[PDB]
């Protein structure tokens, strides 16, 4: 179990750790989050009591170093940092626990939800989508735009998701125009899986990171990427059985975990009605279809 200490909490802010979140009052003595489960990626995020705009946060993994949070009054936000002094860091962490000023990551032991949302998410891949390689953790916020969004401004702050475009030379072999646009199997399996992503797990991992950024920051271009990656699978006639079955699990926990009030902006009606009812893989998403119908029959 690992710890992410906070130097202080000088402004009123709602803090999230993964799917959990806590209200912290201006200069309440909050000094960190303990018992964070080793072995997965994590995200720690913020929404100031005063600006319900700009949700922001940090993807990290505690195996890659000792991280703490510190409010910056110049830049106006909670910043994630690395302590390189191992001894100086266990010292901080042990004193705040002794004083019991830290919350416990509140994991029910029956609950695989976080593991189910991050199964294929790996910190190394995240740091390629969010290039900033003097930190081992990654910043994301509400307003960051993706590489594909920018093509249609500032690249240092871009989300370098893999560009998927159904009407591009990449997607469409010449002479197979009609075939390849109606049956994207060759874009999916040769171009994206074997070509770019190399395996299904990196693809799933990007799909999943996209979702989480959409859900936790309302990053609209991540939402677009999650939908595009779902759609490319569902619109392919030939998909390894192991991907179809894993996809149905992946989507099930994403749909399950989504705040009920948010379905309207985070769920693209066309994509889901095509995937679940019109696509080649209509019949291969039995759990995702059951949960979508019982929870959001309106969208359908």
């Amino acid at each position: 179990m690992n710890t992410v200490p906070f130097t202080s909490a000088p402004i009123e802010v709602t803090i999230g750790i993964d799917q959990y979140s806590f209200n912290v009052k201006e200069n309440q003595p909050f000094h960190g989050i303990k018992d964070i489960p080793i072995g997965h990626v994590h995200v720690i995020h913020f929404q100031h009591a005063d600006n319900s705009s700009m949700r922001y946060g940090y993807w990290f993994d505690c195996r890659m170093g000792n991280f703490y949070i510190q409010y910056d009054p110049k830049d106006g936000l909670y910043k994630m940092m690395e302590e390189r002094d191992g001894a100086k860091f266990e010292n901080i962490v042990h004193n705040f626990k002794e004083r019991q000023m830290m919350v416990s990551y509140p994991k029910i032991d029956e609950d695989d939800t976080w593991y189910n949302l991050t199964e294929f998410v790996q910190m190394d891949k995240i740091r390629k989508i969010v290039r900033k390689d003097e930190n081992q953790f990654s910043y994301v916020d509400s307003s960051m735009t993706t590489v594909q969004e920018n093509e249609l401004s500032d690249p240092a702050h871009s989300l370098n998701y893999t560009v998927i475009n159904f009407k591009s030379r990449e997607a469409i072999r010449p002479g197979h125009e009609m075939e390849d646009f109606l049956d994207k199997s060759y874009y999916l399996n040769t171009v994206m899986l074997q070509g770019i992503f190399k395996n299904s797990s990196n693809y799933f991992g990007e799909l999943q990171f996209a979702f989480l950024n959409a859900m936790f920051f309302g990053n609209y271009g991540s939402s677009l990427q999650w939908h595009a990656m779902i759609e490319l699978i569902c619109s392919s006639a030939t998909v390894p059985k192991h991907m179809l079955d894993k996809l149905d699990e992946i989507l099930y926990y994403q749909i399950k975990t989504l705040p009920e009030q948010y379905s309207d902006i985070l769920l693209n009606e066309r994509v889901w009605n095509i995937c679940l009812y019109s696509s080649f893989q209509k019949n291969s998403l039995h759990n995702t279809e059951k949960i979508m119908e019982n929870k959001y029959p309106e969208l359908l």
């Binding site: 009407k167 591009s168 030379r169 469409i172 125009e177 009609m178 646009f181």
Partner: protein, 237 residues
């Protein structure tokens, strides 16, 4: 964006553009089988590709053999149209390639776009206009060349004959769509009006009679009266 009554006159500027009408690409008769089931028999079709500015018509004939052994033919008809339009553009010298292609039916956008991926600077546009180009097979010479064809074949025409010697493009296109609007609503009447006078002939290199200017005015009025009448009849106004 889409083409409509507001930006109508853009059709007649000096930016090369073509209309693609796909309505007659896939044509069938519907009949009964010996066992009483229904079946279709395909007949020859045509893509109607038209430069509204100059009258040039790229009549690509679609031979029934194209369909042999194919499923989902009405869907395939759209991809074939897009394929042939793409091949046409590719065959034209650069300075003749269009800057815009306007498809009369929105279902053509995705097939055409996909087939034009090599021509990113050619804009594919829909239209809100209700153009009568399905009546192109009501022009006898066009229906004749399509129905006799024994192979794929492109036949080139000027759909305005020699009108542009005496009128503008804008007015030529208005005449053409009025004629074809009338052929569509009541072909028998429309064709009666055009040939009632045996002394007015069609040149061998033309599609329409050689009306004088004054005779065209009477024709146009007779076509307008035909179209209005048919409307009251349709709706009982």
């Amino acid at each position: 964006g889409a083409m409509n009554s507001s930006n109508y006159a853009e059709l007649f500027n000096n930016d090369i553009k073509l209309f693609v009408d796909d309505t007659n690409v896939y044509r069938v008769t519907v009949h009964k089988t010996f066992e009483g089931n229904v079946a279709t028999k395909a007949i020859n079709g045509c893509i109607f590709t038209l430069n509204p500015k100059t009258g040039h018509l790229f009549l690509k004939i679609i031979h029934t053999s194209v369909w042999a052994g194919q499923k989902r033919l009405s869907q395939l008809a759209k991809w074939k149209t897009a394929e042939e339009v793409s091949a046409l553009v590719r065959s034209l010298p650069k300075e003749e390639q269009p800057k815009q292609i306007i498809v009369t039916r929105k279902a053509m956008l995705d097939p055409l776009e996909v087939h034009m991926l090599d021509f990113p600077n050619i804009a594919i546009r829909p239209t809100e206009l209700r153009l009568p180009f399905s009546a192109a097979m009501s022009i006898d010479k066009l229906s004749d060349v399509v129905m006799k064809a024994t192979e794929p074949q492109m036949v080139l025409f000027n759909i305005y004959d020699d009108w542009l010697d005496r009128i503008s493009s804008y007015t030529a296109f208005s005449r053409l769509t009025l004629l074809l609007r009338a052929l569509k609503t009541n072909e028998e009447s429309a064709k009666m009006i055009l040939l009632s006078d045996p002394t007015i002939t069609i040149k061998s290199y033309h599609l329409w009679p050689s009306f004088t200017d004054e005779q065209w005015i009477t024709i146009e009025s007779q076509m307008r009266d035909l179209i209005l009448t048919e409307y009251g009849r349709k709706y009982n106004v």
